[PDB]
Design a protein around this ligand. Sequence first.
Ligand SMILES: Nc1ncnc2c1ncn2[C@@H]1O[C@H](COP(=O)(O)OC(=O)Cc2ccccc2)[C@@H](O)[C@H]1O
Ligand SMILES: Nc1ncnc2c1ncn2[C@@H]1O[C@H](COP(=O)(O)OC(=O)Cc2ccccc2)[C@@H](O)[C@H]1O
Ligand SMILES: O=C(O)Cc1ccccc1
Ligand SMILES: [Mg+2]
Ligand SMILES: [Mg+2]
Ligand SMILES: [Mg+2]
Ligand SMILES: [Mg+2]
Lengths: 423, 426
Amino acid sequence: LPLEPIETASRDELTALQLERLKWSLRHAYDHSPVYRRKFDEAGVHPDDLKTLADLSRFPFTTKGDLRDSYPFGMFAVPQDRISRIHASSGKPTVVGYTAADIDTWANLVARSIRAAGARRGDKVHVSYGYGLFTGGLGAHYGAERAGLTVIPFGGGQTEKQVQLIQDFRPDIIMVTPSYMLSIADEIERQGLDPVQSSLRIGIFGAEPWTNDMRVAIEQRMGIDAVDIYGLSEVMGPGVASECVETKDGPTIWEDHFYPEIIDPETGEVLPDGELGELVFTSLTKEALPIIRYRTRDLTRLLPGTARTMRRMEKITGRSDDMMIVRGVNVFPTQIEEQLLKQRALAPHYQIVLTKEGPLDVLTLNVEPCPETAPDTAAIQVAKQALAYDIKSLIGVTAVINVLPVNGIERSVGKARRVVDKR
Amino acid sequence: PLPLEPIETASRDELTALQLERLKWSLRHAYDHSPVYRRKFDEAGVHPDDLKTLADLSRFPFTTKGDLRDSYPFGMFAVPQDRISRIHASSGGKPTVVGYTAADIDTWANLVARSIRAAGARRGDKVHVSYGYGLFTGGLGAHYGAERAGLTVIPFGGGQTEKQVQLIQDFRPDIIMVTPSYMLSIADEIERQGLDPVQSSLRIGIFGAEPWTNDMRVAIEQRMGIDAVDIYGLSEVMGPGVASECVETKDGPTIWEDHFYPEIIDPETGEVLPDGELGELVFTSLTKEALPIIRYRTRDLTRLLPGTARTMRRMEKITGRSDDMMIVRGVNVFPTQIEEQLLKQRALAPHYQIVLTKEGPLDVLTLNVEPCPETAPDTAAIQVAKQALAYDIKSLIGVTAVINVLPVNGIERSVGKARRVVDKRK
Ligand SMILES: Nc1ncnc2c1ncn2[C@@H]1O[C@H](COP(=O)(O)OC(=O)Cc2ccccc2)[C@@H](O)[C@H]1O
Ligand SMILES: Nc1ncnc2c1ncn2[C@@H]1O[C@H](COP(=O)(O)OC(=O)Cc2ccccc2)[C@@H](O)[C@H]1O
Ligand SMILES: O=C(O)Cc1ccccc1
Ligand SMILES: [Mg+2]
Ligand SMILES: [Mg+2]
Ligand SMILES: [Mg+2]
Ligand SMILES: [Mg+2]
């Protein structure tokens, strides 16, 4: 229940903290990571050139290629014997590491994120994020444990068994991807139960893009508060930022630990708060793998603090990676998702399939009926036309709507694979 | 190196005293706070107060898996739900559910750390954890222990074997923590892609979760150029790290009896046996809060042996357990008995599975095996192998076995516990 002092501090208290910590972090990286010594020298800046927070623009960016070029351990700023934990993003994987203090800090931040989501003394947390080299499972695990809660460490897959245990154990909180949540909801219904009636009070969903419409759908279907938790393995894992449940106004960034920037992704210039651009993070307390101006490839804007003094990120729907170019039109999967979720006759499952027929791109949107609407041809043909129209007019691409049998699309077990490009 | 805890080689006299005080506490905690032990002790006519010495333990009733099953999901917990930090559960009736306070979790991490040190771990070691992460106790058990020991934890878990071998190459782990059956598949994949297993960074393997012969041990040790040690546990008592082998002696898991007090009973009468005599191994938790367990019958068969590298006693490597013991034409046989004969054949792989059928009055035991890749095309070598193997099984175990040589990779590979026996009779 109880907040940390730092969570209610003046913008000036925070600002002083960030400066002290950024000074430390830049110096630590320059002194102890051979990659940052080189990158800084080769960019012509010294850690001493930071006198204020604005000075951060002087320092070079880090990107995934920096890690890939120093695989496996080349970027670590402590000796291998102080590395307590390795994690790896399967997409050679990109490898990250943590001292025992880093693991402690990560636990504290995920515990903070779980409090922010409205957790209470006595709550059980059903963890469905993948356990392994992925950051999700073990991040949520240690965070729920640190928060003093009852942890049920299920991980991914075995969906019928997960539903069995949600009934039997009665967890209050589930920590799982939005796309897997929808499959879990399905299976509940299949087992002839009312998901609304489950014990779950709270979902903490993340690891992939999910629209606010997707949130409201899940909240309706499940009878829960559904909050948005963000981060990426290079920066720490889950718990870089997380939504306050009392405001649900985008994830609040824990910028006592992670200093955010928004840049023009073409030029590299820093933009004032409010402006759309690429999200960039600098770690302020990380030991094993300090990261300096890491380019997330996520597009969003910074916004003033509400439920906290710290700022929020606008929800992420667009990341550069999985943008599609179709007949010379730019489209994110979430743009398609928003149109799909307008059709109450269709499932919230889909895959986009990209093919070439002649010179012209074809976008095919694979979808399903709801089980109860499957036989209702009128309902489905309305959905199919409307969806087709909405994509044309709101997105500007012509989509072939392909209505499969129920269970025809392959269900996510973690991060959903929205797009199969075979062009 | 890594340092002993003082308790590990402190006098037996000191050990006995602290086991007594802890056992008096454990019995009282269970009786006062667990609805199940309140009922059990009352219905046996015993009170915690009745324990004056360690020998009085035989006065108290047994616990079995049935007791946990009947109290699913939480009926056996001895603290309020809000003090349960962790739930674990079986994957294979309904699952049996166990629980832990934060202190239980701490002690578990310390015990697995102790086991990892006993395996010869060094400052700077990386630990590759291939035990399954989730409701199973293995992965998160090993994980927390290796973390607590101050080592570099690589939390892979099970499956993705080709990627696991990639990262043993890339990361150069020093210790691997995995089931012996899966280890074998990992080594196969090393050879396949196409490296010299003996040339790995791996120095130590800490293998458990399932029965495996000392023959298997020497096989893996020779193949991988490692030390292989035996780590034991069961989720009802704690998880991995109830007992673990010292690398300097490799003489059976040393039981951590400062935390888990072992007995050996005659499984038929429940009579307590003297140390050295074979029987069923029974545990009583000494410091557990959430799920105190009193005289838990493990169904594992073994004997207690005097401590060597530690003050604490050892179990003999587990000779057998009731769960996958076969009765074949009147003869009781454990899968490991078959494993021991299989491992004599160098032309055959170390993978196997037993399938039982009926033909008229006869139990038919078919032992599915594979050739080595190298010897696969050597039909004469395979024939000599089938023949010697079938003979060894008849002459040494007294059973008639059909040896069924499958193609390479024809037996489905374990990523955790191998399913040794497929019983298709009725
Ligand atoms: N809440 C979110 N909204 C949108 N995208 C997200 C969100 N959270 C993660 N992503 C995307 O996935 C990346 C990183 O994937 P990566 O595997 O490195 O890290 C883990 O997904 C860490 C995580 C696990 C569980 C919950 C939250 C976060 C990030 O840069 C975003 O593009
Ligand atoms: N070293 C071993 N030798 C023989 N059998 C073992 C060994 N270790 C576990 N077993 C068997 O498997 C059970 C329990 O399975 P359960 O799932 O409850 O717990 C985990 O197997 C705990 C474990 C995980 C990882 C390593 C070691 C131990 C026990 O009663 C034995 O019959
Ligand atoms: O490998 C990844 O980065 C993606 C992932 C998501 C969920 C579970 C495991 C892996
Ligand atoms: Mg409800
Ligand atoms: Mg719909
Ligand atoms: Mg070697
Ligand atoms: Mg052989």
